[PDB]
Scaffold this active site. Structure first.
Site, PDB file in Angstrom:
ATOM      1  N   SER A 141       0.852  -1.223   0.000  1.00  0.00           N
ATOM      2  CA  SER A 141       0.000   0.000   0.000  1.00  0.00           C
ATOM      3  C   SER A 141       0.879   1.262   0.000  1.00  0.00           C
ATOM      4  O   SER A 141       0.544   2.233  -0.724  1.00  0.00           O
ATOM      5  CB  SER A 141      -1.012  -0.032   1.096  1.00  0.00           C
ATOM      6  OG  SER A 141      -0.528   0.638   2.235  1.00  0.00           O
ATOM      7  N   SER A 142       1.926   1.252   0.835  1.00  0.00           N
ATOM      8  CA  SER A 142       3.070   2.199   0.837  1.00  0.00           C
ATOM      9  C   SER A 142       3.412   2.628  -0.594  1.00  0.00           C
ATOM     10  O   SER A 142       3.155   3.774  -0.967  1.00  0.00           O
ATOM     11  CB  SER A 142       4.257   1.528   1.496  1.00  0.00           C
ATOM     12  OG  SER A 142       4.387   0.166   1.055  1.00  0.00           O
ATOM     13  N   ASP A 191       9.345  -3.052  -4.045  1.00  0.00           N
ATOM     14  CA  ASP A 191       7.884  -2.746  -4.146  1.00  0.00           C
ATOM     15  C   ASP A 191       7.633  -1.695  -5.242  1.00  0.00           C
ATOM     16  O   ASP A 191       6.682  -1.823  -6.095  1.00  0.00           O
ATOM     17  CB  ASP A 191       7.314  -2.270  -2.801  1.00  0.00           C
ATOM     18  CG  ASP A 191       7.560  -3.234  -1.664  1.00  0.00           C
ATOM     19  OD1 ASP A 191       7.780  -4.466  -1.972  1.00  0.00           O
ATOM     20  OD2 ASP A 191       7.526  -2.766  -0.478  1.00  0.00           O
TER      21      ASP A 191
END
Ligand SMILES: OC[C@H]1O[C@H](O)[C@H](O)[C@@H](O)[C@H]1O
Ligand SMILES: [Cl-]
Length: 418
Positions: A141-142, A191
């Site tokens: 989500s970061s 990510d």
């Protein structure tokens, strides 16, 4: 007691529609546009990214949407659709590292990062976020929040880094730098490369050697689950995990001290030395005899074997050897549990249920200490295994889990201009 819930990705239309409405409701003016970055699953190569190793993420269909309008001044307003009454407001002029706390740290930090890099065109903005990348799921989500903001700021300020792969590594470094230095949450690069550089139907074979150019550090690997009648099950355990608790950082520090005793720049040097040895067992043995600490031997033994499992997985999947691919998932988990010690009961039990109910393989994905498991299962079996995990979870007295459809989807893009 109710059936396990599947979290459906927001469509293009739902994301644009909900982002803009939250924008208009909070600010009154129309945004300049709507941008979006996906969450991710890391198929294999866990706790490798900050050791200069190999990773293999896919982007989820699940996306954070940003409605953004730049401002003439240095003020930044942000609002999230999970609390559409709390507008966070901050100022870029003279802003210091750690100079924002709470979730507003992440998107503010992105402009902060770009101005630190010499992008003097970048001032403030108003933004409204709506996401379906579940919080605490370990599905990034970061990164979805930072990489959407970085693509929006690149576009509205005309920086010229958004319309190429090579270009986005500059936006990625900014997003990484926001998370590390403004949000003060340690992060290793996996990510945000996934969120900005994956493509539909492909996994990103990411080489994290920091000396590599962008064209040298990615290979798109075919990852078409339908070709082999597969489904990738993703189950968010919903186990309790303090967002940023020091465990992840301890790991990074142990590895960094591993590399120093070993006299290498990073553990990928050590891993590559062992891999090309005739007698890999003798090469790992001589390496671990150099580390006097029991726990440090286990961390290095995880990072060395995990990098090789990425090369082994890439071969297995391209050969259609889904049994061999599943065993590589199983070995990565088992290593994360025993040697890296980043699993929790919820992750181990979810994996065991998947294993015993016909998964080719199953593993925790991302950082650990909670979050999500992933399972290579036969097409049409995802619901059954998810429901078996949920029933076990209730018998255990665990919080209910939730599952996500998953497949290799597109990276960050602009969704709407006018
Ligand atoms: O593979 C471990 C993984 O953990 C978290 O998701 C980090 O933010 C990533 O950079 C990566 O280190
Ligand atoms: Cl609120």
């Amino acid at each position: 007691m109710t059936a396990v819930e599947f979290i459906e990705p927001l469509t293009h239309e739902e994301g644009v529609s909900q982002a803009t409405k939250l924008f208009v409701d909070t600010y009154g003016a129309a945004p300049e546009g709507v941008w979006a970055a996906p969450g991710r699953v890391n198929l294999i190569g866990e706790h490798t990214d900050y050791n200069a190793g190999l990773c293999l993420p896919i982007a989820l269909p699940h996306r954070t949407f940003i409605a953004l309008k730049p401002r003439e001044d240095t003020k930044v307003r942000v609002v999230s659709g999970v609390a559409p009454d709390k507008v966070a407001e901050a100022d870029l002029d003279g802003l210091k590292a750690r100079g924002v706390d709470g979730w507003s740290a992440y998107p503010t930090g992105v402009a902060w990062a770009l101005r630190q890099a010499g992008f003097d065109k970048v001032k403030g903005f108003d933004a409204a976020f709506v996401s379906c990348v579940p919080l605490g799921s370990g599905l990034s989500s970061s990164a979805a929040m930072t990489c959407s903001t970085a693509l929006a700021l690149d576009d509205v300020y005309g920086l010229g880094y958004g319309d190429s792969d090579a270009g986005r590594v500059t936006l990625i470094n900014a997003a990484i730098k926001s998370e590390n230095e403004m949000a003060g949450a340690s992060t290793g690069g996996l990510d945000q490369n996934a969120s900005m550089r994956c493509t539909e139907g492909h996994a990103l074979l990411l080489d994290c050697r920091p000396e590599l150019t962008p064209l040298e550090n990615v290979s798109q690997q075919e990852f078409d689950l339908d070709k082999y009648n597969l489904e990738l099950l993703v189950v968010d355990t919903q186990a309790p995990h303090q967002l940023n608790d020091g465990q992840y950082a301890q790991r990074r520090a142990t590895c960094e001290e591993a590399a120093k005793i070993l006299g290498v720049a990073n553990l990928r040097v050590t891993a590559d030395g062992i891999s090309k040895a005739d007698d890999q067992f003798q090469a790992l043995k001589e390496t671990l005899d150099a580390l006097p600490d029991e726990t440090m031997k286990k961390r290095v033994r995880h990072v060395v074997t995990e990098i090789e499992r990425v090369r082994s997985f890439v071969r297995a999947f391209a050969q259609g050897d889904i049994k061999a691919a599943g065993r590589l998932f199983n070995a990565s988990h088992d290593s994360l549990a025993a040697d890296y010690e980043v699993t929790v009961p919820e992750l181990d039990i979810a994996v065991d249920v998947a294993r015993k109910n016909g998964a080719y393989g199953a593993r925790m994905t991302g950082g650990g200490f909670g979050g999500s498991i992933i399972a290579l299962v036969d097409k049409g079996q995802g619901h059954e295994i998810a429901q078996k995990i949920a029933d076990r979870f209730e018998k255990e007295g665990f919080n209910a889990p939730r599952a996500l459809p998953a497949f290799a989807a597109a990276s960050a893009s602009r969704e709407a201009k006018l």
